[PDB]
Every structure is written in structure tokens, then in C-alpha cells.
Design goal:
This is part of a larger assembly, with chains A (459 residues) and B (171 residues). Chain A is mainly α and 459 residues long. Chain A is globular, with a radius of gyration of 21 Å. By secondary structure, chain B is an all-alpha fold. Helix content of chain B is 44%, strand content 0%. Chain B is elongated and about 100 Å long. The termini of chain B are far apart. Chains A and B meet through loops of A and loops of B. The complex binds cardiolipin (2 copies), 1,2-diacyl-SN-glycero-3-phosphocholine and 1,2-Distearoyl-sn-glycerophosphoethanolamine. One cardiolipin (CDL) sits at the interface of chains A and B. The site of one cardiolipin has 16 residues of chain A, from helix 17 and helix 20. Chain A: Belongs to the complex I subunit 4 family.
């Protein structure tokens, strides 16, 4: 994995030795080359993971997250170069450096063979993200957004450090390859109960769990667009990746300890989706939709059946692409009306027809339209939770009603109806913006032709 | 612990040297000359045994040899010695320097009638060798077995197995 870490590192001289006008072009070009190179991680086998070294490996779980991670960086650089056009050159290079450093931490968060190196990169992803949100955010509440984002995360993860060092001292190694073969059954005790909670609550925070989700609608709406894209697309999926690694060790206690965290998810995806029926802010609606979609991934990991893991990893990749596109579309309106209010600018299919087609496709992939990988992940989670308990289909099916009822409402409020009369700075769609929407949607649609590369280690 | 083992009262009875300190200090140099051998056997036994209970008999030899020192003064030179310890006995600090004429008379009468040379300045502070037949005490501190020390380090120092082994550092 050292053929991906060193090009990402070499993007630091590439953004700091460039001309004052070429720093977006060079970083976009070479990060697109790194994203093209990311497809060599598809050397996956039906029995063995792709094990590079003592430090780095990549199974079929980490590989789609890595391809999505290395693909998201040129897209964040395309989204972020408009609102940072008046920016100082040094601060512009600092923003590009924080995105590069965040990519560098993510691509060896997902490949960390050993779990405390996973912890160090997993908690190292805070600091560039914190700096991006609290420095290049727009409003007053970006500082409170950074405080909530930092102190839910570290409150969840500082027990995780102690739990991982306990596993290091007890088992002898936090190598995930050794812990596949030295895993012992975790019995029923209070020590093992708080062992389970210390292993899980960090990822429950970063997914987010319902009830712990309160950092997210502050951290998504107060971030800039590259921050919103990286929290939606990747930084929620650190929790899912970490759960799918750490629930190996947490058996058979999970089979009676996951009950409060499934209910909180199965009712919470009803609540947050319901919140999306009444959100006046468009970016907050996309944030609460992200909570609603990651609650299904929480249920699918906690029931730990194979169909559930396959649906959860397909749902993570699909939701990453879809929610990143939704934040980019909301940014496309915010760069024209300079307010995130969803009822402000209406009727925008008369004014931006092709951008309304991109809104339509992103709204259809939000509501899980088949055969998209959104519906593949949604459907497989619903199948495995029907296997879990037959009554859950109620809480599933009702959610699939409400997920439609805000996916099209967002389509009808922003793009349909009579347009706002007193708004006249509605420019035609830039080629940068349509390129950004197409680079989100066209991989999301091509992955319907071959979904087997985004279905985890147990396809 | 154990019973302390003391000698009886009959074991300690000996004919004491019942003279005053000025009588002793007046005869001190000739006592250090003539009564050398049992005194040094006793003080050697006293620093080697480190226990007075194992030094009584030699000590009795001291109390045997001092009295024969004084009787040999009493048989021959009782009156110049009597004047000399009286003159020593007058002073508070008991100065030898205030009594040099009685010292000269006592030393002359002793050297004539008994043939004793007074030790010079420096002789009585010498460290002398003592020929005894008593055994050397093999454990005068009544000590016991010292504990076994920890084993030392040996063997050639090989490198560390797989480096530091600190969570993920492969060196
Ligand atoms: C590996 C090779 C693969 C080759 C094949 C490609 C495979 C799929 C790739 C993506 C295909 C869709 C891309 C086009 C849509 C986005 C752009 C757009 O706005 O188009 C309008 C525009 C035409 O409009 P216009 O009149 O010029 O002006 C626009 C209007 O102003 C405003 O526009 P509008 O209002 O007129 O249009 C809105 C309308 C709205 O219509 C709809 O939304 C209705 C259609 C969707 C719902 C109903 C169907 C559900 C699925 C059933 C069909 C699939 C399965 C069938 C198989 C049998 C059964 C299983 O959109 C459409 O009709 C688009 C048709 C395609 C829709 C596909 C489904 C998207 C819905 C969301 C997800 C659904 C599940 C996933 C499906 C995955 C399929 C693979 O299109 C173009 O200009 C096309 C440009 C070139 C597109 C290239 C696409 C491929 C790129 C991949 C590159 C790399 C690989 C190389 C292959 C290249 C192939 C050429
Ligand atoms: C004929 C006689 C002469 C022949 C000469 C032939 C050779 C000529 C060249 C000689 C000079 C040395 C060149 C490098 C040798 C290979 C080192 C290497 O890649 O180790 C892989 C090392 C372990 O990978 P591996 O797959 O297990 O084994 C591959 C090797 O065989 C690993 O081999 P190993 O087992 O022997 O490695 C020992 C151990 C193996 O590693 C471990 O045991 C794992 C733990 C390592 C530390 C993890 C700490 C995590 C928490 C802190 C993270 C900080 C933030 C991350 C970086 C942010 C950017 C600043 O490494 C360490 O203990 C050293 C710590 C890492 C330093 C690596 C050397 C860097 C030199 C250049 C510095 C440039 C900035 C680097 C980034 C700064 C942070 C390091 O990878 C990492 O730890 C991940 C980070 C990447 C390493 C540094 C990349 C070096 C090239 C950078 C070029 C681009 C720079 C752009 C500007 C600066 C950044 C903004
Ligand atoms: C995000 C907000 C909520 C955060 C919740 C975080 C998880 C909740 C539980 C965390 C417990 C603390 C870490 C436990 C690590 C367990 C390691 C282990 O093996 O323990 C076995 C050991 C057992 O000891 P032992 O295993 O060494 O003993 C030898 C073995 N026997 C038992 C056979 C003798 O457990 C403990 O010692 C105590 C475990 C419970 C700890 C109670 C104190 C902490 C209380 C909860 C704090 C939660 C966060 C607070 C912050 C909130 C925000 C400000
Ligand atoms: C909403 C905010 C955001 C989300 C925060 C987190 C919410 C989810 C986590 C808390 C939910 C409730 C606690 C977990 C319930 C399921 C497991 C459990 O503890 O069951 C209750 C237990 C049943 O008893 P028993 O099965 O005998 O357990 C003995 C274990 N050796 O009952 C008992 O033993 C009696 C009660 C013991 C004390 C419980 C409270 C302290 C410990 C848990 C914290």
C-alpha cells in the first residue's frame, strides 16, 4: 500500500511547488491519476485478503472504501475551487494540504492491518477535518460544530484506546490477521459488557448512532463543501469499517448486547427520516438523511449475518456517492442564492434544466431506485433483518415510504413549482458543476453493471 | 530469642588493682614497658573476640601482671614512687610536666634497683605483634549465611527479536 501513500504524500510538494494559478489543475490531475491507480486493489481472492506487508493489507471491505476515498479527492478539489477563488494563495495551498493529508490518513486507516494503527489513523482524521470545518466554514456556528464533532468523537474513542490496549495485552497482538485465528469467545460478564461498549461506542458515534447523532447536522452544514463531501462520503464509514473489524472479537456477547443499539437504529431511522420531512435547511435535510441511511448499516453490522454485511458495505459505498452528490447540488444552489434555505429558491427546473436532471437522478438514488447499488444495499439489509425478526419489515417498509417522501419533496421544493420572482442571479450551470455531478453519478450508475466489487469480504 | 549467657559472680572474682588513677598514671610508662605481653594478648583477644565474656581469663592475666608490677615497686622503690604519685596527684589535669624532679628520682631509683628503662617519646603507641596459641575466631560477628546473589549476565548480545515489538513498529 506504499504505492498509494507515497503519491498522496508527493501531492504535498505538488501543491506547494506549483504556480499560483496551476494549483487546482495539478492536484486535480495527479489525484485523478492516483484514483486511476486505486483500481489495482481489486486483486481480491475468494479465500485470502490482499496482504501487502506487516503493516498494510486490503480485503474486499477496505478496497471499495479506498477506491471511493481516492476518487473523492479530485471531486472535493473541483467543488472547493469556486468559493476559494478570492482566497490567499497560502491559505489555498493550506486547504489543499488539509484535503491531501486527510486522504493520506484515510487510505492507511482502511488498510491498517493492526488495530492500534487503525486507531491512530482513525483519530488522526479529526485534525485536518477539524481545521477544514472550523477554518474554511462559512457561518458563526462552525466553531461549535468543530467542538461537537471533536468531543463526541474523542468521548467515544478514548475508551476504544483502552479496550484495544487490553486486547493487545491479553491476546498478544492487535493484528487483524492473527485475531482471525486467535479469537476467543467473549463470555457474559460485566467486564465483557463494558469491553463491548468500549469497542463499539466510538464507531457508534462516528456512524452516527441515533441519540449520538447530534454532532452531524452541525458538522455537515457548517463545513465547506469539501468537508461536507468527506464527512458524508468517507468519514461516516470509518465507523462501519471499524465495527466490521471489531465485531470479530465481540462474540457471542453481541447476540445479546446489540439489542439496545438496534432499537435506537430501527426507530432512529424512522425519526431522522421524519426530520427530513420538515427541514427548512437543505444541507440539514441531507445531513439527517445521512443519519437515516447509516442507521441501516448499524443494524446490518449488529445482526452480523453475511447478507447484512454485503448490504451494509454496498449501502456505505452507494450512500457515499449519493450523499456527496446531494451536498454538491445543495452547494450549487448556495453559490447562487447565498442561503441554504430550501424554500428560498424554487422552480429551478425552468432555470437550470440539466442541473434539475442531476437533482432528479440524485433524488432517485436517494430513494433507492433499482437496480442502483443504493437499492442493492437497502434491499439486502432489509432481507437480513427480515431474517432477524419478521416484524422489522414494518420499520423497514415505513422508512422506505418516508425516504421517498423527502427525496422527492426536496426535488419538488427546490426544482419544481413557480420560481422565485425576486431572485435573478441564477446563473446557468458551469461546466465545473455539471462535471462534478457527472463524476458523482456516472460511477454510481456504472456500479449497477458490476456490483460484486462493492459487496465486501464475503461475496 | 535466646537466653543471654553471662558468667557467674564467682567467675568474675579477681584480686583488683586497688590503687588510684594518679598511682596508675605515675607508673604508666613502666607499666607499658614491663607488663607488655599479657596486656597485648588481652587487647588482641578483646578486638578479635569482640565479646568480653570470651576475654575474662586473659583479663585475669592482666590483673595478675599489674599487681606483680606494683609489689616489685613496693619491695624496692616504694618511697620515691610515693613522692612521685603524690606530686602527680596534686595537680588537676595531673601534669607530667609539673613533676619532673620526682620523675627523675623515680626513674633513677628504678633503673638502679630494678633495671627498667622508661619508654621514650613514641614507643608506647607502636603497633606490636603478639604470639598467641588461641585460635583465630572464624566468625566473631556470629553472622550467618549471606544470601545467594542474582545471576550475572552472560552470552553474546544478539539483536532484538523482530525489533521493538511496540504495537506495530517493525523496527
Ligand atoms: C461499461 C459501459 C457502459 C455503457 C452503458 C451505460 C451504463 C449506465 C451509465 C449511466 C447512464 C445514464 C447517464 C445519462 C444520465 C445523466 C446525464 C443526463 O442528464 O442525460 C440527459 C442527456 C440528454 O438530454 P438533453 O435533451 O440533451 O438535455 C438534458 C435535459 O435538459 C434534462 O434531462 P432530462 O430531463 O431530459 O433527462 C432526465 C431523465 C430522467 O429519466 C429517468 O430518471 C427515468 C429512467 C430511470 C428510472 C426508470 C428505469 C429504472 C432502471 C431500468 C433500466 C435499467 C435496467 C434495464 C435492463 C433490463 C432489466 C433489468 O434522464 C434519463 O432519461 C437518463 C437515462 C438513463 C437513466 C439511468 C437510470 C438513472 C436513474 C437513477 C438510478 C436508477 C437505478 C440505476 C440504473 C443503472 C443502469 C445501468 O443525456 C446525455 O446528454 C448523455 C450524455 C452521455 C452519457 C454517458 C453515460 C455513460 C458514461 C460512462 C462513461 C464511462 C464508461 C463508458 C461508457 C459510455 C457509454 C456512452
Ligand atoms: C547500497 C547501499 C545504499 C542503498 C540505498 C537504498 C535506499 C535508498 C533510499 C534510502 C532512504 C530511505 C527512503 C525510504 C525507505 C522506506 C521507508 C518507508 O516507506 O517505510 C514504509 C512504512 C512501513 O511500510 P511497510 O509496508 O510495512 O514496509 C515497507 C518498507 O519495507 C519499510 O521498511 P522497514 O521495515 O525497514 O521500515 C521501518 C519502519 C516501518 O514502519 C513501521 O514499523 C510502521 C510504523 C511507522 C510509523 C507510523 C506512525 C503513525 C503515527 C504518525 C503518523 C504521522 C503522519 C503521517 C504522515 C503525514 C505526512 C507528513 O519505519 C519506521 O520505523 C520509520 C517511520 C516511518 C518513516 C519512513 C521513512 C520516511 C523518510 C522520508 C520522510 C518523509 C515524510 C514521511 C512521513 C512522515 C511520517 C512518517 O510506511 C509507513 O509507515 C507509512 C508512511 C509512509 C512512509 C514514508 C514514505 C517515504 C517516502 C516519502 C516520499 C514523499 C515525501 C513527500 C513530502 C513529505 C510528506 C509531506
Ligand atoms: C459517547 C458517549 C458515551 C461513551 C461510552 C463509552 C463506552 C462505555 C463504557 C466504557 C468503559 C470504560 C472502558 C472500558 C474498557 C474495558 C476493558 C476491559 O477489558 O475491562 C475489563 C475490566 C475488568 O478487570 P480485569 O479484566 O483487568 O480483571 C482481571 C479479570 N477478572 C475480572 C477475572 C478478575 O473492567 C474494568 O476494570 C472496568 C470496566 C468498566 C469501567 C467503568 C468506568 C468507566 C465508566 C464509563 C465511561 C464511559 C465514557 C465516559 C465519558 C462520557 C462523555 C464525557
Ligand atoms: C440515548 C442516549 C444515546 C445512547 C446511549 C447508549 C444507549 C444504549 C446502551 C444502554 C442501554 C441499556 C443497557 C443495556 C441493556 C442490554 C444488556 C444489559 O445490560 O441487560 C440488562 C441486564 C439484564 O440482566 P442480565 O441479563 O442478568 O445481565 C447480567 C450480565 N452479566 O440488567 C441488569 O443486569 C440490571 C441493571 C444493571 C445496571 C444497568 C445500568 C448500568 C450499566 C449499563 C450502562
Amino acid at each position: 500500500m506504499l504505492k498509494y501513500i507515497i503519491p498522496t504524500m508527493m501531492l504535498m510538494p505538488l501543491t506547494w511547488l506549483s504556480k499560483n494559478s496551476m494549483i487546482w489543475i495539478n492536484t486535480t490531475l495527479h489525484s485523478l491519476l492516483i484514483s486511476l491507480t486505486s483500481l489495482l486493489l481489486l486483486n481480491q481472492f475468494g479465500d485470502n485478503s490482499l496482504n501487502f506487508s506487516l503493516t498494510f493489507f486490503s480485503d474486499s471491505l477496505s478496497t471499495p472504501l479506498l477506491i471511493l476515498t481516492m476518487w473523492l479527492l479530485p471531486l472535493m478539489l473541483m467543488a472547493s475551487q469556486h468559493h476559494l477563488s478570492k482566497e490567499n494563495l497560502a491559505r489555498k495551498k493550506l486547504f489543499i494540504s488539509m484535503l491531501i493529508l486527510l486522504q493520506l490518513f484515510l487510505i492507511m486507516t482502511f488498510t491498517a492491518t493492526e488495530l492500534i494503527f487503525f486507531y491512530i489513523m482513525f483519530e488522526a482524521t479529526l485534525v485536518p477535518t477539524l481545521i477544514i470545518i472550523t477554518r474554511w466554514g462559512n457561518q458563526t456556528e462552525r466553531l461549535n460544530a468543530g467542538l461537537y464533532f471533536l468531543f463526541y468523537t474523542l468521548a467515544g474513542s478514548l475508551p476504544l484506546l483502552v479496550a484495544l490496549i487490553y486486547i493487545q495485552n491479553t491476546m498478544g497482538s492487535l493484528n487483524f490477521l492473527i485475531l482471525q485465528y486467535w479469537v476467543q469467545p467473549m463470555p457474559n460478564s460485566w467486564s465483557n459488557t463494558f469491553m463491548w461498549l468500549a469497542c463499539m461506542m466510538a464507531f457508534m458515534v462516528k456512524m452516527p448512532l441515533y441519540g449520538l447523532h447530534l454532532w452531524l447536522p452541525k458538522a455537515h452544514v457548517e463545513a465547506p463543501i469539501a468537508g461536507s463531501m468527506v464527512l458524508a462520503a468517507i468519514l461516516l464509514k470509518l465507523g462501519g469499517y471499524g465495527m466490521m473489524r471489531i465485531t470479530l472479537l465481540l462474540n457471542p456477547i453481541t447476540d445479546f448486547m446489540a439489542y439496545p443499539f438496534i432499537m435506537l437504529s430501527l426507530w432512529g431511522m424512522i425519526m431522522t427520516s421524519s426530520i427530513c420531512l420538515r427541514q427548512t435547511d437543505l444541507k440539514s435535510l441531507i445531513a439527517y438523511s445521512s443519519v437515516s441511511h447509516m442507521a441501516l448499516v448499524i443494524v446490518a453490522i449488529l445482526i452480523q449475518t453475511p447478507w447484512s454485511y454485503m448490504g451494509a458495505t454496498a449501502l456505505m459505498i452507494a450512500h457515499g456517492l449519493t450523499s456527496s452528490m446531494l451536498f454538491c447540488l445543495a452547494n450549487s444552489n448556495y453559490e447562487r442564492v447565498h442561503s441554504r434555505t430550501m424554500i428560498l429558491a424554487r422552480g429551478l427546473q425552468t432555470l437550470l434544466p440539466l442541473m434539475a436532471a442531476w437533482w432528479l437522478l440524485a433524488s432517485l438514488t436517494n430513494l433507492a431506485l433499482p437496480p442502483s447499488i443504493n437499492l442493492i444495499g437497502e434491499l439486502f439489509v432489509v432481507m437480513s433483518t427480515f431474517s432477524w425478526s419478521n416484524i422489522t419489515i414494518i420499520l423497514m417498509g415505513l422508512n422506505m415510504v418516508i425516504t421517498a417522501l423527502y427525496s422527492l419533496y426536496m426535488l419538488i421544493t427546490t426544482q419544481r413549482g413557480k420560481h422565485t420572482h425576486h431572485i435573478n442571479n441564477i446563473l446557468p450551470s458551469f461546466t465545473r458543476e455539471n462535471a462534478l455531478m457527472s463524476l458523482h453519478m456516472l460511477p454510481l450508475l456504472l456500479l449497477s453493471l458490476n456490483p460484486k466489487i462493492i459487496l465486501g469480504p464475503l461475496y | 530469642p535466646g537466653i543471654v549467657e553471662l558468667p557467674s559472680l564467682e567467675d568474675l572474682k579477681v584480686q583488683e588493682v586497688k590503687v588510684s588513677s594518679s598511682v596508675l598514671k605515675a607508673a604508666a610508662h613502666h607499666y607499658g614497658a614491663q607488663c607488655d605481653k599479657p596486656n597485648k594478648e588481652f587487647m588482641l583477644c578483646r578486638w578479635e573476640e569482640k565479646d568480653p565474656r570470651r576475654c575474662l581469663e586473659e583479663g585475669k592475666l592482666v590483673n595478675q601482671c599489674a599487681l606483680e608490677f606494683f609489689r616489685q615497686i613496693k619491695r624496692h622503690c616504694a618511697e620515691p614512687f610515693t613522692e612521685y604519685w603524690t606530686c602527680i596527684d596534686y595537680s588537676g589535669l595531673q601534669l607530667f610536666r609539673r613533676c619532673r624532679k620526682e620523675q627523675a628520682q623515680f626513674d633513677k631509683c628504678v633503673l638502679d634497683k630494678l633495671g627498667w628503662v622508661r619508654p621514650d617519646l613514641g614507643e608506647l603507641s607502636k603497633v606490636t605483634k603478639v604470639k598467641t596459641d588461641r585460635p583465630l575466631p572464624e566468625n566473631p560477628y556470629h553472622s550467618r549465611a549471606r544470601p545467594e546473589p542474582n545471576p550475572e549476565v552472560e552470552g553474546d548480545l544478539k539483536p532484538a527479536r523482530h525489533g521493538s515489538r511496540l504495537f506495530f513498529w517493525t523496527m
